[PDB]
Scaffold this motif. Structure first.
Motif, PDB file in Angstrom:
ATOM      1  N   UNK A  64       0.800  -1.229   0.000  1.00  0.00           N
ATOM      2  CA  UNK A  64       0.000   0.000   0.000  1.00  0.00           C
ATOM      3  C   UNK A  64       0.832   1.278   0.000  1.00  0.00           C
ATOM      4  N   UNK A  65       2.092   1.214   0.420  1.00  0.00           N
ATOM      5  CA  UNK A  65       2.940   2.407   0.495  1.00  0.00           C
ATOM      6  C   UNK A  65       4.114   2.400  -0.478  1.00  0.00           C
ATOM      7  N   UNK A  66       4.094   1.468  -1.430  1.00  0.00           N
ATOM      8  CA  UNK A  66       5.099   1.529  -2.460  1.00  0.00           C
ATOM      9  C   UNK A  66       4.950   2.926  -3.096  1.00  0.00           C
ATOM     10  N   UNK A  67       6.066   3.663  -3.161  1.00  0.00           N
ATOM     11  CA  UNK A  67       6.043   5.110  -3.397  1.00  0.00           C
ATOM     12  C   UNK A  67       6.185   5.610  -4.821  1.00  0.00           C
ATOM     13  N   UNK A  68       6.490   4.728  -5.776  1.00  0.00           N
ATOM     14  CA  UNK A  68       6.953   5.307  -7.055  1.00  0.00           C
ATOM     15  C   UNK A  68       5.762   5.727  -7.910  1.00  0.00           C
ATOM     16  N   UNK A  69       5.786   6.970  -8.399  1.00  0.00           N
ATOM     17  CA  UNK A  69       4.679   7.448  -9.231  1.00  0.00           C
ATOM     18  C   UNK A  69       5.216   7.630 -10.652  1.00  0.00           C
ATOM     19  N   UNK A 315      15.265  11.232  -5.342  1.00  0.00           N
ATOM     20  CA  UNK A 315      15.337  10.166  -4.315  1.00  0.00           C
ATOM     21  C   UNK A 315      14.964   8.829  -4.977  1.00  0.00           C
ATOM     22  N   UNK A 316      15.786   8.417  -5.938  1.00  0.00           N
ATOM     23  CA  UNK A 316      15.553   7.181  -6.677  1.00  0.00           C
ATOM     24  C   UNK A 316      15.681   5.937  -5.791  1.00  0.00           C
ATOM     25  N   UNK A 317      14.964   4.880  -6.160  1.00  0.00           N
ATOM     26  CA  UNK A 317      15.233   3.554  -5.630  1.00  0.00           C
ATOM     27  C   UNK A 317      16.693   3.207  -5.934  1.00  0.00           C
ATOM     28  N   UNK A 318      17.183   3.486  -7.139  1.00  0.00           N
ATOM     29  CA  UNK A 318      18.577   3.259  -7.497  1.00  0.00           C
ATOM     30  C   UNK A 318      19.565   3.812  -6.488  1.00  0.00           C
ATOM     31  N   UNK A 319      19.279   4.987  -5.951  1.00  0.00           N
ATOM     32  CA  UNK A 319      20.270   5.619  -5.090  1.00  0.00           C
ATOM     33  C   UNK A 319      20.556   4.810  -3.836  1.00  0.00           C
ATOM     34  N   UNK A 338      13.352  15.920  -4.185  1.00  0.00           N
ATOM     35  CA  UNK A 338      12.522  14.986  -4.947  1.00  0.00           C
ATOM     36  C   UNK A 338      11.058  15.440  -5.054  1.00  0.00           C
ATOM     37  N   UNK A 339      10.405  15.108  -6.166  1.00  0.00           N
ATOM     38  CA  UNK A 339       9.060  15.649  -6.355  1.00  0.00           C
ATOM     39  C   UNK A 339       7.954  14.759  -5.814  1.00  0.00           C
ATOM     40  N   UNK A 356      13.753  16.247   0.735  1.00  0.00           N
ATOM     41  CA  UNK A 356      13.039  17.521   0.741  1.00  0.00           C
ATOM     42  C   UNK A 356      12.375  17.739  -0.626  1.00  0.00           C
ATOM     43  N   UNK A 357      11.261  18.491  -0.683  1.00  0.00           N
ATOM     44  CA  UNK A 357      10.628  18.748  -1.972  1.00  0.00           C
ATOM     45  C   UNK A 357      11.609  19.488  -2.878  1.00  0.00           C
ATOM     46  N   UNK A 358      11.505  19.231  -4.178  1.00  0.00           N
ATOM     47  CA  UNK A 358      12.404  19.831  -5.169  1.00  0.00           C
ATOM     48  C   UNK A 358      12.148  21.321  -5.205  1.00  0.00           C
ATOM     49  N   UNK A 359      10.942  21.702  -4.804  1.00  0.00           N
ATOM     50  CA  UNK A 359      10.632  23.116  -4.721  1.00  0.00           C
ATOM     51  C   UNK A 359      11.579  23.791  -3.735  1.00  0.00           C
TER      52      UNK A 359
END
Ligand SMILES: Cc1cn([C@H]2C[C@H](O)[C@@H](COP(=O)(O)OP(=O)(O)O[C@@H]3C[C@](C)(N)C(=O)[C@@H](C)O3)O2)c(=O)[nH]c1=O
Ligand SMILES: Nc1ncnc2c1ncn2[C@@H]1O[C@H](CSCC[C@H](N)C(=O)O)[C@@H](O)[C@H]1O
Ligand SMILES: [Zn+2]
Length: 404
Positions: A64-69, A315-319, A338-339, A356-359
Motif C-alpha cells: 500500500x505504500x510503495x512510493x513510485x509514481x 530520491x531514486x530507488x537506485x540511489x 525529490x518531487x 526535501x521537496x524539489x521546490x
C-alpha cells in the motif's frame, strides 16, 4: 543458487553487500531498524540469465505504500502515451480488443487505452498507485499477475490481444509463473511485450545503481530469447529505448506464429560479438563498479574538505545502492531533493539522508548536486537552468564520475 528461469547454476560476479529495501523512506522519528538482505548478482550457467542471488519477498516491496509514481516524469508520460497509440494502431485493431498491463502503477500507459474506449485491465498490487489509476477511470485489479490470477482473468474476460509490462517483468523472480499466466491469457495470435533495463547498457555505462532489490533480472536479448523459447514463446522483435538509462523492449509471440524481425538476430549477434554475457565481461563490469565507488567517494570527501556544499537530486530507488555500497550519508550529501510527496520529509533507506521537496532546491543553491536521477538528466536540468546559471554544478557517476 538455482536459476529462476531454467534451474541451472548461478555464478556470482558482483557483491554489493548488505542493502536495505530501496523504496522504503522512513520518517526521521522512526526507529532505525530496517530489513536488510545481501545484494549480489550472478549469471546462470545454462541460459545466460543475469539475476540476483537473494529474492526479497514481493510483499515487502510492493504494497500500500510503495512510493513510485510513474507519471512524475513528462518524458515517461509521453513515452507511454506513444506506446499506447502504437498498440491501438497495430495489435488492438480488432473488434473488441483487450489489453492487460502488468504493473500499470498510476495509469501512465493505460489512460491512453481507456481514452480510446478499448477494453483493458491493469494489474497493480501496490494499492496507493492503483488508486491513482482508478481515479483516471482505468480498470485495475489490486493483485499480482501470476499463473492463478491470469487464469482468473482468462475465465472472466477472455484472451488478451496484448499483455504489456514496463519496468515490471524484471522485478519478478517468479517469471515462470508469469509466463504460465501469459500462456493461459494471451490470444493465440497476440504478443507479450515488455521493456526493462538492458544488460548491455548497464555494462557499457557501469550503471550498477540499476542493481537493487526490485531489479531481480538484468535481461539481455540472449537470455530473453532462451527464456521465451523454454516456455513455448519466441522473441520476435527487439527495440532499444533510451529511457531509464537504456532499455530493450522485447516482443514475445507464440512459437512460429510470427517471423522474427531482423533486429532480433542483429542484437543477438552484437551481444555475442561483444561477449556481453561472458563471465569475464561481467567481472570486468564488477571491477569498474569498484572504481566508480572509489572515485565518487574520493570526490565527495574532497568537496567537503574544500568547504563546498553537496546535495543529491532525485530520491531514486537506485540511489539506495549508491549510498549504501559507497557509504555516503548526510555528512557528505546533506539532502536529497525529490518531487514525490510521500518521499518528502523522510529519510533515504540505509543512509538516512533527508529528502526535501524539489521546490526547496532554490536560491541560495548548494555548490553541487549529485544527480541520482541521472536517467532524467535532460528533463531535470531543463527545469533547473537557474541552478546551473548561478554556478551550481552537477555531479554524475554514470558512465564515469565527472562534474558539469
Ligand atoms: C523526472 C523527475 C524525477 N524526480 C524524482 C522522482 C522520483 O522519485 C525520482 C526518479 O525516479 P526514477 O529514476 O524514475 O526511478 P527509480 O530509480 O526510483 O526506480 C523506480 C523503482 C522501480 C519501480 N523499481 C523502477 O524500476 C522504476 C521504474 O521506478 O526522481 C524529480 O524529483 N524531478 C524530476 O523532474
Ligand atoms: N506480479 C506483479 N504483477 C503486477 N504488477 C506488479 C507485480 N510485481 C510488482 N508489480 C508492480 O510493478 C510496478 C513497477 S513500477 C513500473 C510502473 C510503470 N509500468 C512504469 O514503467 O513506470 C509497481 O507499481 C509494482 O507494484
Ligand atoms: Zn538459467
Amino acid at each position: 543458487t538455482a536459476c529462476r528461469v531454467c534451474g541451472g547454476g548461478v555464478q556470482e560476479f558482483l557483491d554489493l553487500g548488505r542493502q536495505p529495501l530501496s523504496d522504503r523512506f522512513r520518517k526521521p522519528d522512526e526507529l532505525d531498524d530496517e530489513f536488510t538482505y545481501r545484494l549480489a548478482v550472478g549469471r546462470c550457467d545454462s541460459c545466460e540469465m543475469v539475476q540476483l542471488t537473494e529474492e526479497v519477498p514481493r510483499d515487502l516491496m510492493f504494497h500500500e505504500v510503495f512510493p513510485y509514481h510513474s507519471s512524475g516524469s513528462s518524458v515517461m508520460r509521453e513515452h507511454f502515451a506513444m506506446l499506447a497509440r502504437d498498440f491501438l494502431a497495430t495489435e488492438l485493431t480488432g473488434p473488441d480488443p483487450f489489453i492487460v498491463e502488468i504493473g500499470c502503477n498510476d495509469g501512465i500507459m493505460l489512460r491512453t487505452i481507456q481514452e480510446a474506449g478499448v477494453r483493458h485491465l491493469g494489474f497493480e498490487p501496490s494499492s496507493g498507485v492503483a488508486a491513482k489509476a482508478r481515479e483516471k477511470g482505468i480498470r485495475v485489479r489490486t493483485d499480482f499477475f501470476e499463473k492463478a490470477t491470469a487464469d482468473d482473468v482468462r475465465r472472466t474476460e477472455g484472451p488478451a490481444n496484448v499483455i504489456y509490462a514496463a519496468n515490471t517483468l524484471c522485478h519478478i523472480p517468479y517469471v515462470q509463473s508469469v509466463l504460465e499466466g501469459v500462456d493461459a491469457l494471451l490470444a493465440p495470435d497476440g504478443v507479450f511485450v515488455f521493456e526493462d533495463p538492458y544488460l548491455g547498457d548497464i555494462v557499457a555505462k557501469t550503471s550498477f545503481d540499476q542493481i537493487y532489490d526490485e531489479h531481480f533480472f538484468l535481461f539481455s536479448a540472449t537470455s530473453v530469447q532462451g527464456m521465451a523459447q523454454r516456455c513455448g514463446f519466441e522473441l520476435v522483435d527487439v527495440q532499444r529505448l533510451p529511457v531509464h538509462g537504456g532499455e530493450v523492449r522485447y516482443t514475445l509471440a507464440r512459437q512460429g506464429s510470427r517471423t522474427p524481425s531482423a533486429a532480433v538476430a542483429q542484437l543477438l549477434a552484437a551481444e555475442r560479438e561483444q561477449e556481453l554475457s561472458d563471465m569475464a565481461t561481467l567481472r570486468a563490469f564488477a571491477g569498474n563498479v569498484v572504481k566508480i565507488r572509489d572515485e565518487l567517494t574520493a570526490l565527495l570527501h574532497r568537496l567537503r574538505a574544500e568547504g563546498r556544499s553537496v546535495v543529491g537530486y532525485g530520491a531514486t530507488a537506485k540511489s539506495a545502492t549508491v549510498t549504501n555500497f559507497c557509504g555516503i550519508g548526510p555528512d557528505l550529501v546533506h539532502s536529497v531533493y525529490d518531487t514525490t510527496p510521500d518521499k518528502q520529509n523522510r529519510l533515504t533507506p540505509g543512509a538516512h539522508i533527508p529528502v526535501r521537496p524539489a521546490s526547496a532546491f532554490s536560491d541560495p543553491y548548494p555548490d553541487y548536486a549529485l544527480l541520482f536521477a541521472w536517467n532524467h538528466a535532460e528533463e531535470i536540468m531543463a527545469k533547473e537552468q537557474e541552478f546551473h546559471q548561478a554556478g551550481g554544478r552537477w555531479i554524475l557517476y554514470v558512465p564515469e564520475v565527472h562534474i558539469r
